[model samples]
Target: MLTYGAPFNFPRWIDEHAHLLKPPVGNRQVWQDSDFIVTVVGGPNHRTDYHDDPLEEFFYQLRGNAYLNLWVDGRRERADLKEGDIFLLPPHVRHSAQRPEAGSACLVIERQRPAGMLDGFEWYCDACGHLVHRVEVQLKSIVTDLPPLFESFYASEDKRRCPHCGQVHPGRAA
Candidate 1:
């Protein structure tokens, strides 16, 4: 078990998880506790779904630059962050973080969900900006639970196809 409330060096932590700071392996858990969940996520990630969280999320750019895309009041908005920038996203917001630069990383912090609280993973249509599909989950372990949700959504043609525009959401290649 990890000893909580200890002062840990970021550079050393990043160095130790150097293997995970690459493509495909994303947002590795940094702290193991009940109240809050913290993760270190590396760059060059193309995420297609917007996460809907009932609680606020803390975002800090650990290295390089990054972009946060948000769906606010039915429209799209972007928040740009540099290496030292920090942002506190409001609750119940739909957000997607984009890391296009290699070696760039960010620290994300959020409170762990209680029994019935759920997080929403939703995909929208690129052509018409309409909701394609939405899946509500009790996010316990992000690494273990998220991939299968992505797989099930991408595997079905009926789920990927948008009803409003008939445009298919092209998921990441196998």
Candidate 2:
């Protein structure tokens, strides 16, 4: 019973599209028709910002091991996921993904945003690591809008420089 497309075979999908995971947290989306979006993520980069999403996100570890660097209970904590592990994060919790292996991948499930939904991006001071600066914007598209924010932050030295301690979150990292 094929509808929008054929049924997904996850392993085959990964073998074909593993290259997409080379940058920006490497997720290749397969389905976005339902209320939920399904994407396969691979590897990681030095992403330090807490991603504030409008949906309660789910993660099913597909390959290798990784960590969910979550801001829980008023502070940051780590949730480890080896292969076959699954986790669900509630809405409004600021979090980021951590991939320790080069071949790591995960199946992520999150709901599509309704109109007027906004995603928040926040960065704590690089030096002090306590003072935070946040930018909230309407998410028109993740591929188009989100990359520009990272690009802007990278080019501006003032943006990476800490307001209090003056330490820089150097290089192509954010």
Candidate 3:
């Protein structure tokens, strides 16, 4: 356990645990449960969702290529990260990372969230060009916290339906 404000020895090598993340796109925490958190992430596989992180985030690519899509105040851009490349994502920016291939790996670092900060995910309605769903979540741990929302949203066609349009959002339907 990483105690509050105490420095801990980093694991000898991130790749030491080849399957820490396990399969398609696995990840494991390296250091966390304190003011700062460090994690090793495998392939993201593809673009996930439009999400915002309140904590400042850092990422370093250890192998292959990682593509980062960023949306800052509605301006979107793409970044290609190769080996030795790193990125620092500002707080409150909406971003997503996609892993380029098998064996793609990266190290991520970020501070724990401050009081009252929330993580948000927004799904837009392509049919009517309106906001479809927006969820604000308080994160305790990423390992246990993120899956439910994806499951809830992805499994429900009603939640994915566009309020402004009659079309069902292209999810499993598309």
Candidate 4:
């Protein structure tokens, strides 16, 4: 089991798990999961793909905002999350997450296991045939499970569209 404290020293912890974190193209400090096994992430521009793991996952937003996209049985749904929100995901589900335009910092918790077990995995949206990263797919489910906060955010005449595949998802009562 893993444990952490409030006012957690992100830099130090990230340094210790640099191998597990996936750094952005130009940003060295911005990292994804550390170890790909059981990990925790906190920062902006964080993203993941639609793939399955041998273990389950728990994500909580500690600060800022994030966009989560989840695909179930070819249908796609979205959720926007803020501080004090949390969600869980079972293995083999397609999901993911992003910082959106406002950017975000979050905490991701998952089991510790061998990375080799995740081989031959991919994230695909059956409805639109859009392919996404495994981690991103996992994070999306977390956001969709959020309460009414997401409904108010998307309350507009024009609905939100998926740039990756050009799919429009409208806002509705949760």
User: Which of the two candidates, 3 or 4, achieves a greater lDDT against the reference?
Assistant: 3
Q: Give the winner by TM-score.
A: 1
Stretches > 4 Å off in candidate 2:
1-3, 32-34
The reply for model 1, stretches above 4 Å from the true place, is 1-5
lDDT of 4 by residue, 9-55 (tens): 76576556544433332112223344433334434444333445456
Candidate 2 or 3, higher TM-score?
Answer: 2
How many backbone clashes are present in model 1? Answer: 0
lDDT of each: 0.85, 0.77, 0.72, 0.48
Worst 10 residues of 3 by lDDT: 1-10
Give residue 81's lDDT in candidate 4 (0 to 100): 69
- Candidate with better TM-score, 1 vs 2: 1
Q: Model 2, clash count?
A: 1
lDDT of 2 by residue, 1-174 (tens): 565587777788798887887674477877656666777888865477778997788999989888878878877788888899999988888887878677778899887788888888877664566644667878655687888887787687777777777787663654
Cα RMSD, each candidate:
2.1, 2.4, 3.4, 12.1
lDDT of 2: 0.77
Residue 32, model 2: Cα distance from true site in angstroms: 4.8
Weakest 10 consecutive residues of candidate 4 by summed lDDT: 133-142
In model 3, the clashing pairs are: 21-26, 21-27
Off by over 4 Å in 4: 1-38, 46-48, 101-103, 114-116, 119-174
